[PDB]
Amino acid sequence: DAPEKNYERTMAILQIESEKAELRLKELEVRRLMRAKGDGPWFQYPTIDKALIDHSPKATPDN
Amino acid sequence: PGIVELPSLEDLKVQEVKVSSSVLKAAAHHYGAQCDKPNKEFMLCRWEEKDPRRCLE
């Protein structure tokens, strides 16, 4: 292979791997922030569905 | 937390219906026929306010 081919192929390889490395560091930072704060789509541990609540007038009024 | 607000003992004074339960149960059908409107105003206020302090009148 030519030095041109090896050179520019090395540049493409280095671009792809540097971009994957930056995305891995961002993935770690996103995971840390979403576990700490809990406002992302991840770490959403379930709560009680409020569709289960009965809203009818009950037997006694004070409720 | 906050202080609970209660009505005075003057606001809880009313002429009670001092009869027995058989006197009420004997009269209950005509009582439900005749005393409809204040009773249902009270029970509507009682299920909507959910507070016996807003229902004393």
Side-chain angles (χ1 to χ4, degrees), chain B residues 8-21:
Chain B
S8 67
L9 298 176
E10 292 293 330
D11 294 331
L12 300 170
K13 290 178 185 291
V14 69
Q15 190 180 2
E16 296 290 329
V17 180
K18 297 297 291 293
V19 299
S20 293
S21 66

mmCIF file with all atom_site columns, all heavy atoms in Angstrom, chain B residues 8-21:
data_model
loop_
_atom_site.group_PDB
_atom_site.id
_atom_site.type_symbol
_atom_site.label_atom_id
_atom_site.label_alt_id
_atom_site.label_comp_id
_atom_site.label_asym_id
_atom_site.label_entity_id
_atom_site.label_seq_id
_atom_site.pdbx_PDB_ins_code
_atom_site.Cartn_x
_atom_site.Cartn_y
_atom_site.Cartn_z
_atom_site.occupancy
_atom_site.B_iso_or_equiv
_atom_site.pdbx_formal_charge
_atom_site.auth_seq_id
_atom_site.auth_comp_id
_atom_site.auth_asym_id
_atom_site.auth_atom_id
_atom_site.pdbx_PDB_model_num
ATOM 1   N N   . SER B 1 8  ? -65.350 27.921 68.394 1.00 0.00 ? 8  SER B N   1
ATOM 2   C CA  . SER B 1 8  ? -65.587 28.069 69.816 1.00 0.00 ? 8  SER B CA  1
ATOM 3   C C   . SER B 1 8  ? -66.770 27.210 70.245 1.00 0.00 ? 8  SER B C   1
ATOM 4   O O   . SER B 1 8  ? -67.546 26.713 69.425 1.00 0.00 ? 8  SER B O   1
ATOM 5   C CB  . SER B 1 8  ? -65.851 29.529 70.167 1.00 0.00 ? 8  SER B CB  1
ATOM 6   O OG  . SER B 1 8  ? -67.077 29.963 69.609 1.00 0.00 ? 8  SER B OG  1
ATOM 7   N N   . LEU B 1 9  ? -66.914 27.049 71.560 1.00 0.00 ? 9  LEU B N   1
ATOM 8   C CA  . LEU B 1 9  ? -68.033 26.286 72.094 1.00 0.00 ? 9  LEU B CA  1
ATOM 9   C C   . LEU B 1 9  ? -69.358 27.015 71.927 1.00 0.00 ? 9  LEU B C   1
ATOM 10  O O   . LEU B 1 9  ? -70.410 26.384 72.039 1.00 0.00 ? 9  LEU B O   1
ATOM 11  C CB  . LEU B 1 9  ? -67.803 25.978 73.567 1.00 0.00 ? 9  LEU B CB  1
ATOM 12  C CG  . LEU B 1 9  ? -66.588 25.131 73.920 1.00 0.00 ? 9  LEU B CG  1
ATOM 13  C CD1 . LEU B 1 9  ? -66.477 25.012 75.431 1.00 0.00 ? 9  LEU B CD1 1
ATOM 14  C CD2 . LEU B 1 9  ? -66.680 23.773 73.273 1.00 0.00 ? 9  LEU B CD2 1
ATOM 15  N N   . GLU B 1 10 ? -69.329 28.327 71.678 1.00 0.00 ? 10 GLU B N   1
ATOM 16  C CA  . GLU B 1 10 ? -70.546 29.042 71.319 1.00 0.00 ? 10 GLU B CA  1
ATOM 17  C C   . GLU B 1 10 ? -71.017 28.673 69.923 1.00 0.00 ? 10 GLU B C   1
ATOM 18  O O   . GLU B 1 10 ? -72.224 28.674 69.659 1.00 0.00 ? 10 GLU B O   1
ATOM 19  C CB  . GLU B 1 10 ? -70.325 30.550 71.402 1.00 0.00 ? 10 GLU B CB  1
ATOM 20  C CG  . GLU B 1 10 ? -70.101 31.089 72.803 1.00 0.00 ? 10 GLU B CG  1
ATOM 21  C CD  . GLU B 1 10 ? -71.333 30.977 73.680 1.00 0.00 ? 10 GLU B CD  1
ATOM 22  O OE1 . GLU B 1 10 ? -72.463 31.029 73.152 1.00 0.00 ? 10 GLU B OE1 1
ATOM 23  O OE2 . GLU B 1 10 ? -71.169 30.851 74.907 1.00 0.00 ? 10 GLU B OE2 1
ATOM 24  N N   . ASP B 1 11 ? -70.091 28.362 69.021 1.00 0.00 ? 11 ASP B N   1
ATOM 25  C CA  . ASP B 1 11 ? -70.445 27.994 67.661 1.00 0.00 ? 11 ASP B CA  1
ATOM 26  C C   . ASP B 1 11 ? -70.913 26.554 67.548 1.00 0.00 ? 11 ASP B C   1
ATOM 27  O O   . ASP B 1 11 ? -71.400 26.156 66.488 1.00 0.00 ? 11 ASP B O   1
ATOM 28  C CB  . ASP B 1 11 ? -69.250 28.215 66.740 1.00 0.00 ? 11 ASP B CB  1
ATOM 29  C CG  . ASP B 1 11 ? -68.882 29.670 66.621 1.00 0.00 ? 11 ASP B CG  1
ATOM 30  O OD1 . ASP B 1 11 ? -69.789 30.519 66.747 1.00 0.00 ? 11 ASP B OD1 1
ATOM 31  O OD2 . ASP B 1 11 ? -67.688 29.966 66.413 1.00 0.00 ? 11 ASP B OD2 1
ATOM 32  N N   . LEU B 1 12 ? -70.768 25.773 68.608 1.00 0.00 ? 12 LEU B N   1
ATOM 33  C CA  . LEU B 1 12 ? -71.235 24.402 68.645 1.00 0.00 ? 12 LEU B CA  1
ATOM 34  C C   . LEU B 1 12 ? -72.526 24.265 69.430 1.00 0.00 ? 12 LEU B C   1
ATOM 35  O O   . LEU B 1 12 ? -72.999 23.144 69.628 1.00 0.00 ? 12 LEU B O   1
ATOM 36  C CB  . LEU B 1 12 ? -70.151 23.512 69.246 1.00 0.00 ? 12 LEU B CB  1
ATOM 37  C CG  . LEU B 1 12 ? -68.863 23.561 68.429 1.00 0.00 ? 12 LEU B CG  1
ATOM 38  C CD1 . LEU B 1 12 ? -67.751 22.884 69.167 1.00 0.00 ? 12 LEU B CD1 1
ATOM 39  C CD2 . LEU B 1 12 ? -69.081 22.912 67.089 1.00 0.00 ? 12 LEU B CD2 1
ATOM 40  N N   . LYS B 1 13 ? -73.100 25.379 69.879 1.00 0.00 ? 13 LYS B N   1
ATOM 41  C CA  . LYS B 1 13 ? -74.376 25.367 70.577 1.00 0.00 ? 13 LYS B CA  1
ATOM 42  C C   . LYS B 1 13 ? -75.519 25.350 69.577 1.00 0.00 ? 13 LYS B C   1
ATOM 43  O O   . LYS B 1 13 ? -75.613 26.222 68.709 1.00 0.00 ? 13 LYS B O   1
ATOM 44  C CB  . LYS B 1 13 ? -74.502 26.588 71.485 1.00 0.00 ? 13 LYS B CB  1
ATOM 45  C CG  . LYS B 1 13 ? -73.594 26.578 72.692 1.00 0.00 ? 13 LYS B CG  1
ATOM 46  C CD  . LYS B 1 13 ? -73.754 27.848 73.509 1.00 0.00 ? 13 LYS B CD  1
ATOM 47  C CE  . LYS B 1 13 ? -72.760 27.897 74.658 1.00 0.00 ? 13 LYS B CE  1
ATOM 48  N NZ  . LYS B 1 13 ? -73.045 26.880 75.705 1.00 0.00 ? 13 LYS B NZ  1
ATOM 49  N N   . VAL B 1 14 ? -76.396 24.359 69.713 1.00 0.00 ? 14 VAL B N   1
ATOM 50  C CA  . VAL B 1 14 ? -77.595 24.237 68.899 1.00 0.00 ? 14 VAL B CA  1
ATOM 51  C C   . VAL B 1 14 ? -78.594 23.447 69.732 1.00 0.00 ? 14 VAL B C   1
ATOM 52  O O   . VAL B 1 14 ? -78.224 22.721 70.656 1.00 0.00 ? 14 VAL B O   1
ATOM 53  C CB  . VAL B 1 14 ? -77.281 23.559 67.539 1.00 0.00 ? 14 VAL B CB  1
ATOM 54  C CG1 . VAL B 1 14 ? -76.921 22.109 67.731 1.00 0.00 ? 14 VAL B CG1 1
ATOM 55  C CG2 . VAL B 1 14 ? -78.409 23.735 66.517 1.00 0.00 ? 14 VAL B CG2 1
ATOM 56  N N   . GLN B 1 15 ? -79.876 23.634 69.445 1.00 0.00 ? 15 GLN B N   1
ATOM 57  C CA  . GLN B 1 15 ? -80.918 22.862 70.104 1.00 0.00 ? 15 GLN B CA  1
ATOM 58  C C   . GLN B 1 15 ? -80.915 21.458 69.509 1.00 0.00 ? 15 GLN B C   1
ATOM 59  O O   . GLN B 1 15 ? -81.317 21.263 68.358 1.00 0.00 ? 15 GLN B O   1
ATOM 60  C CB  . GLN B 1 15 ? -82.265 23.555 69.935 1.00 0.00 ? 15 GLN B CB  1
ATOM 61  C CG  . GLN B 1 15 ? -83.375 22.974 70.780 1.00 0.00 ? 15 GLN B CG  1
ATOM 62  C CD  . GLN B 1 15 ? -84.688 23.693 70.573 1.00 0.00 ? 15 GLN B CD  1
ATOM 63  O OE1 . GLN B 1 15 ? -84.780 24.619 69.769 1.00 0.00 ? 15 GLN B OE1 1
ATOM 64  N NE2 . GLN B 1 15 ? -85.716 23.264 71.291 1.00 0.00 ? 15 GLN B NE2 1
ATOM 65  N N   . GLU B 1 16 ? -80.436 20.483 70.279 1.00 0.00 ? 16 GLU B N   1
ATOM 66  C CA  . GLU B 1 16 ? -80.282 19.122 69.792 1.00 0.00 ? 16 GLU B CA  1
ATOM 67  C C   . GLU B 1 16 ? -81.635 18.435 69.642 1.00 0.00 ? 16 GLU B C   1
ATOM 68  O O   . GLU B 1 16 ? -82.643 18.852 70.218 1.00 0.00 ? 16 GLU B O   1
ATOM 69  C CB  . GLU B 1 16 ? -79.415 18.306 70.749 1.00 0.00 ? 16 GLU B CB  1
ATOM 70  C CG  . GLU B 1 16 ? -77.975 18.775 70.888 1.00 0.00 ? 16 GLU B CG  1
ATOM 71  C CD  . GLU B 1 16 ? -77.146 18.527 69.644 1.00 0.00 ? 16 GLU B CD  1
ATOM 72  O OE1 . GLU B 1 16 ? -77.419 17.542 68.927 1.00 0.00 ? 16 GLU B OE1 1
ATOM 73  O OE2 . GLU B 1 16 ? -76.211 19.313 69.390 1.00 0.00 ? 16 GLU B OE2 1
ATOM 74  N N   . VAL B 1 17 ? -81.648 17.360 68.854 1.00 0.00 ? 17 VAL B N   1
ATOM 75  C CA  . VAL B 1 17 ? -82.825 16.499 68.731 1.00 0.00 ? 17 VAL B CA  1
ATOM 76  C C   . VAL B 1 17 ? -82.631 15.395 69.765 1.00 0.00 ? 17 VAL B C   1
ATOM 77  O O   . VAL B 1 17 ? -82.023 14.358 69.503 1.00 0.00 ? 17 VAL B O   1
ATOM 78  C CB  . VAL B 1 17 ? -83.003 15.959 67.313 1.00 0.00 ? 17 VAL B CB  1
ATOM 79  C CG1 . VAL B 1 17 ? -84.218 15.075 67.229 1.00 0.00 ? 17 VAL B CG1 1
ATOM 80  C CG2 . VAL B 1 17 ? -83.166 17.089 66.342 1.00 0.00 ? 17 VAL B CG2 1
ATOM 81  N N   . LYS B 1 18 ? -83.131 15.636 70.971 1.00 0.00 ? 18 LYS B N   1
ATOM 82  C CA  . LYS B 1 18 ? -82.913 14.735 72.103 1.00 0.00 ? 18 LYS B CA  1
ATOM 83  C C   . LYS B 1 18 ? -83.964 13.633 72.163 1.00 0.00 ? 18 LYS B C   1
ATOM 84  O O   . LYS B 1 18 ? -84.629 13.452 73.177 1.00 0.00 ? 18 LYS B O   1
ATOM 85  C CB  . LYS B 1 18 ? -82.895 15.530 73.403 1.00 0.00 ? 18 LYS B CB  1
ATOM 86  C CG  . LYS B 1 18 ? -81.775 16.537 73.509 1.00 0.00 ? 18 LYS B CG  1
ATOM 87  C CD  . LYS B 1 18 ? -80.427 15.853 73.483 1.00 0.00 ? 18 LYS B CD  1
ATOM 88  C CE  . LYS B 1 18 ? -80.189 15.035 74.739 1.00 0.00 ? 18 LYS B CE  1
ATOM 89  N NZ  . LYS B 1 18 ? -80.066 15.886 75.956 1.00 0.00 ? 18 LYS B NZ  1
ATOM 90  N N   . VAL B 1 19 ? -84.128 12.885 71.079 1.00 0.00 ? 19 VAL B N   1
ATOM 91  C CA  . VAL B 1 19 ? -85.030 11.749 71.066 1.00 0.00 ? 19 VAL B CA  1
ATOM 92  C C   . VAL B 1 19 ? -84.213 10.468 70.944 1.00 0.00 ? 19 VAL B C   1
ATOM 93  O O   . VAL B 1 19 ? -83.001 10.493 70.736 1.00 0.00 ? 19 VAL B O   1
ATOM 94  C CB  . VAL B 1 19 ? -86.079 11.849 69.947 1.00 0.00 ? 19 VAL B CB  1
ATOM 95  C CG1 . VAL B 1 19 ? -86.924 13.089 70.134 1.00 0.00 ? 19 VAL B CG1 1
ATOM 96  C CG2 . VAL B 1 19 ? -85.420 11.840 68.598 1.00 0.00 ? 19 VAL B CG2 1
ATOM 97  N N   . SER B 1 20 ? -84.891 9.336  71.096 1.00 0.00 ? 20 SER B N   1
ATOM 98  C CA  . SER B 1 20 ? -84.203 8.059  71.022 1.00 0.00 ? 20 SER B CA  1
ATOM 99  C C   . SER B 1 20 ? -84.153 7.553  69.585 1.00 0.00 ? 20 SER B C   1
ATOM 100 O O   . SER B 1 20 ? -84.783 8.103  68.680 1.00 0.00 ? 20 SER B O   1
ATOM 101 C CB  . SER B 1 20 ? -84.870 7.032  71.928 1.00 0.00 ? 20 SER B CB  1
ATOM 102 O OG  . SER B 1 20 ? -84.708 7.399  73.281 1.00 0.00 ? 20 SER B OG  1
ATOM 103 N N   . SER B 1 21 ? -83.382 6.483  69.388 1.00 0.00 ? 21 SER B N   1
ATOM 104 C CA  . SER B 1 21 ? -83.153 5.961  68.047 1.00 0.00 ? 21 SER B CA  1
ATOM 105 C C   . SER B 1 21 ? -84.389 5.293  67.474 1.00 0.00 ? 21 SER B C   1
ATOM 106 O O   . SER B 1 21 ? -84.548 5.238  66.253 1.00 0.00 ? 21 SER B O   1
ATOM 107 C CB  . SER B 1 21 ? -82.001 4.969  68.057 1.00 0.00 ? 21 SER B CB  1
ATOM 108 O OG  . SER B 1 21 ? -82.347 3.816  68.799 1.00 0.00 ? 21 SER B OG  1
#
